[PDB]
């Protein structure tokens, strides 16, 4: 009925860690971004990349499936 | 022995079929000036915390402002 929503994530990075090294993590600790991205996600599907600009974000060709 | 994928999320937004079309173009989405100071940190789906984007030497990272 077109009252629909899609939740988008603007992801800038990924890191693979051990479930057991948190919550050894607390405030002040730095978590490092091992894999660096600029993708847009909707649940698990990647829809495409994006560029940050002075206003916010501009998105290159975005998949729709 | 690595379990989990941490995701670093600059911005989230729930979006309509309309606003979805408008981005398929190249229309600008308006983030605050202050976005880099609340980067959400997500493990396999769930929100773990939040923090400012930092640069140490080579790499990028998120200095943790709040957690669990
Ligand atoms: Cl991947």
Author numbering:
A (entry chain A): 5 to 69
B (entry chain B): 2 to 69
Kindly provide excerpts from the paper associated with this entry.
Type III secretion systems (T3SS) allow the transport of protein substrates directly across the double membrane of Gram-negative bacteria. Here we show that a novel, heterotypic interaction between SPOA domains serves as a scaffold for sorting platform assembly in both injectisome and flagellar T3SS. Our structures suggest a partial model for the subtype-specific assembly of the T3SS sorting platforms: the heterotypic interaction between SPOA domains within a given T3SS subtype functions as an adaptor for ATPase and its regulator through interaction with the APAR peptide.
While SPOA1 alone was insoluble, constructs containing both SPOA1 and SPOA2 (residues 140–297) were stable and soluble. We hypothesized that SPOA2 interacts with and stabilizes SPOA1; consistent with this hypothesis, a SPOA1 construct (145–213) could be co-refolded with SPOA2. SPOA1 and SPOA2 form a distinct, heterotypic SPOA–SPOA interaction with an overall topology similar to that of the SPOA2 homodimer. The SPOA1 backbone follows that of the prototypical SPOA fold, retaining the antiparallel beta-sheet floor and fingers-to-palm architecture. In both SPOA1,2 and the SPOA2 homodimer, interacting protomers each bury about 1,800 Å2 against their binding partner. The existence of heterotypic SPOA interactions provides a structural explanation for the observed ∼1:3 stoichiometry of SPOA1 to SPOA2 in SpaO homologues.
